[PDB]
Amino acid sequence: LSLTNSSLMPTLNPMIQQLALAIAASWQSLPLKPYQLPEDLGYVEGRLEGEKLVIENRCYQTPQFRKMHLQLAKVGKGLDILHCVMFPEPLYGLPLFGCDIVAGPGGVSAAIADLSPTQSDRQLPAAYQKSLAELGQPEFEQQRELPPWGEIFSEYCLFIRPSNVTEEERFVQRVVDFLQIHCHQSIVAEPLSEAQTLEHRQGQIHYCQQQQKNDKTRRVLEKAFGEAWAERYMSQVLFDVIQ
Numbered sequence: 001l002s003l004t005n006s007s008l009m010p011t012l013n014p015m016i017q018q019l020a021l022a023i024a025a026s027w028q029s030l031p032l033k034p035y036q037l038p039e040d041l042g043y044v045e046g047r048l049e050g051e052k053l054v055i056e057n058r059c060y061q062t063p064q065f066r067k068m069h070l071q072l073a074k075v076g077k078g079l080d081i082l083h084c085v086m087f088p089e090p091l092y093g094l095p096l097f098g099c100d101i102v103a104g105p106g107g108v109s110a111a112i113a114d115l116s117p118t119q120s121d122r123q124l125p126a127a128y129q130k131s132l133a134e135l136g137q138p139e140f141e142q143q144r145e146l147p148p149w150g151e152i153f154s155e156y157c158l159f160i161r162p163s164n165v166t167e168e169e170r171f172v173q174r175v176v177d178f179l180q181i182h183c184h185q186s187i188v189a190e191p192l193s194e195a196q197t198l199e200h201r202q203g204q205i206h207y208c209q210q211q212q213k214n215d216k217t218r219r220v221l222e223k224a225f226g227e228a229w230a231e232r233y234m235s236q237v238l239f240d241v242i243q
């Protein structure tokens with residue numbers, strides 16, 4: 001999963017670079033297998049009437065994680081995006097790790113990270129609640145309220161505009177902490193019952209359906225590739241509904 005030869009990495013916002021490295025480091029020694037995206041996608045570029053969008057995809061799986069997708073993107077010279085989701089295998093009932101960072105010439109505008117529930121009661125498993133609580137409440141000067149579709153995110157969801165380098169680093173460290181908890185819980189998780197697996201699958205389906213309501217992503221994709229491409233990308237590459 002080496003990022004050493006990434007074409008985008010050298011030109012991305014430093015917070016995005018550090019987060020990409022931290023995600024890759026978390027995954028590096030796992031029992032990884034490739035996950036083939038639709039059309040074996042790995043790098044793509046598109047332009048219509050405006051700026052070009054350039055995307056680099058990395059995607060893996062393990063027995064506990066159905067799909068581990070790290071996607072870096074740049075629109076034109078200055079708009080930088082990191083997208084990451086670890087989709088759980090429903091059999092093990094783990095939450096969804098996700099993060100999104102958007103940055104421009106004015107710095108990072110949006111930083112989101114969560115471990116999101118899949119249970120019918122919309123709660124994280126008890127072990128996650130406990131480990132997350134023990135991190136303490138992080139201090140951020142510019143909190144942002146989630147849009148309605150963001151009901152899918154846990155009570156521990158971060159959504160901020162970082163105010164300075166200190167906050168950028170605090171946010172990255174909290175994502176590192178989330179990944180450490182997630183990787184640990186994955187090694188103590190056992191296969192669940194058919195009824196429980198079903199429940200968790202539905203939580204993941206709902207997560208994907210709600211993520212597809214995000215017009216901030218959709219507009220960026222549409223401006224570079226058009227409506228049909230954006231719909232296929234969001235529904236098949238980013239947030240595939242398992243069935």
Ligand SMILES: C=CC1=C(C)/C(=C/c2[nH]c(/C=C3N=C(/C=C4\NC(=O)C(C)=C4C=C)C(C)=C\3CCC(=O)O)c(CCC(=O)O)c2C)NC1=O
Nearest residue numbers: 081083084085098099100102109110112147216217220221
């Ligand atoms: C893949 C391509 C991709 C694009 C083009 C993208 C764009 C993107 N996402 C954004 C917001 C956002 N992004 C998210 C969250 C997520 N988004 C996610 O993909 C995941 C996994 C999460 C959460 C774990 C949220 C909650 C917002 C704010 C939405 C809003 O303000 O309405 C914004 C607005 C930034 C701002 O208001 O400062 C843009 C331009 N994000 C992307 O990932």
